[PDB]
Design a protein around this ligand. Structure first.
Ligand code: V1S
Ligand code: CA
Ligand code: CA
Ligand code: ZN
Length: 368
């Protein structure tokens, strides 16, 4: 039936600024919050302000030197860290900005606090829209990500759960999470992403894990223009097969909204309903679930998407007519919650979708 939902948000998150021209806008988290407050979604949800994760909590995965660097660098002292910046990939994609470390602490705090709440059996679902920064590596920032809150939250879930399933619906391959757990069978990573002349360049169908982790990494490579029909054709059958064979006791779902139609960086054609159908599918398995954010670069659509996915988590129907809110003008000319797909061609033929699904099914047959 209906589940208890705990939601993590810090009112300062929207003030962090990556810089002029940078597509990552933390303000979209504040737009999501304001929209869901104006729809009345706060009435059946426990809202918590995450603690600022310590350097010590972050070093459960990241190197001591990398976290010390993140804690020390500032725009005013950047000139003295040119060597470490190159070493840690801090530059155009992952710039130095005022409050960078505090931003990482809040993003991470929400994910780890949600995992603790799930471990204590005090909630069925935990939501942290400020998390899902899937590209960060042990000693390297990458793709707008500095601290991998997902890996840290999974490490927390591993204290009480033998097997944890990670599902990533961001348009980009979840490389940092896949790499962290590549040689273990205690985490199965499943990523659906655009593959081919696209960042980060990894996530080939043939990358299935290594050593004890062989068959525990699943990658579904897609082409431009995937729509609700095509995505729905493979998501439920793949997740159902993974659930059947792997039998996880907890799930982490990265809900990157850059897979929506009209995204500034993405090339997919999903609507908010098509994207949210993934949340509905995962929720049906009745397992402890940590829902996280991620990409999303047309910020009015990110707010619509995550507001609707929070409503899905709560089993609350919300009207298509947007309620008045602090960012109402961003939602014109229609002022509706749901979006229409574009006329872009879907390069993912039905035959291609079935063929990739059959190859993934062959790999899933190799599990014990
Ligand atoms: C939060 C999860 C996520 O949604 O999955 C993250 C997506 C990361 C995309 C990284 C990609 N970077 C590149 O394409 C690398 C190859 C370059 C090109 C851009 N330059 C700035 C660096 C090298 C990229 N960088 C940018 C960018 C644009 C303007 C800026 F002022 C700064 C950066 N755009 C893109 C894309 N696509
Ligand atoms: Ca993905
Ligand atoms: Ca794995
Ligand atoms: Zn992305």
């Amino acid at each position: 039936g209906k589940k208890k939902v705990c939601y993590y948000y810090d009112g300062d998150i929207g003030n962090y600024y990556y810089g002029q021209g940078h597509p990552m806008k933390p303000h979209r988290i504040r737009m999501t919050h304001n929209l869901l407050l104006n729809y009345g979604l706060y009435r059946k949800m426990e809202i918590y302000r995450p603690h600022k994760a310590t350097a010590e909590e972050m070093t459960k995965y990241h190197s001591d030197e990398y976290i010390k660097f993140l804690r020390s660098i500032r725009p005013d002292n950047m000139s003295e860290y040119s060597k470490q910046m190159q070493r840690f990939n801090v530059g155009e994609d992952c710039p130095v900005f005022d409050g960078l470390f505090e931003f990482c602490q809040l993003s991470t705090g929400g994910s780890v606090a949600g995992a603790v709440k799930l471990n204590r059996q005090q909630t069925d679902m935990a939501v942290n829209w400020a998390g899902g920064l899937h590209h960060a590596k042990k000693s390297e920032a990458s793709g707008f990500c500095y601290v991998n809150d997902i890996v840290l939250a999974i490490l927390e879930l591993l204290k009480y759960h033998q097997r944890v399933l990670y599902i990533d619906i961001d348009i980009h391959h979840g490389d940092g999470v896949e790499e962290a757990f590549y040689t273990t069978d205690r985490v199965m990573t499943v990523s659906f992403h655009k593959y081919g002349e696209y960042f980060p360049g990894t996530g080939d169908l043939r990358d299935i894990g290594a050593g004890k982790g062989k068959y525990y990494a699943v990658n579904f490579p897609m082409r431009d223009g995937i729509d609700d029909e095509s995505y729905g054709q493979i998501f439920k059958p793949i997740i159902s097969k993974v659930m059947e064979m792997y039998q996880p006791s907890a799930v982490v779902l990265q809900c990157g909204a850059d897979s929506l139609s009209g995204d500034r960086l993405g090339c997919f054609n999903l609507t908010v309903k098509g994207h949210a159908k993934c949340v509905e599918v995962v929720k049906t398995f009745n397992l402890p679930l940590l829902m996280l954010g991620g990409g999303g670069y047309t910020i009015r659509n990110v707010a619509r998407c995550w507001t609707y996915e929070t409503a899905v988590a709560l089993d609350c129907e919300i009207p298509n007519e947007l309620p008045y809110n602090d960012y109402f003008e961003y939602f014109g000319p229609d002022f509706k919650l749901h979006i229409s797909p574009s006329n872009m061609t879907n390069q993912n033929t039905p035959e291609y979708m079935e063929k990739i699904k059959q190859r993934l099914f062959e790999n899933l047959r190799m599990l014990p």
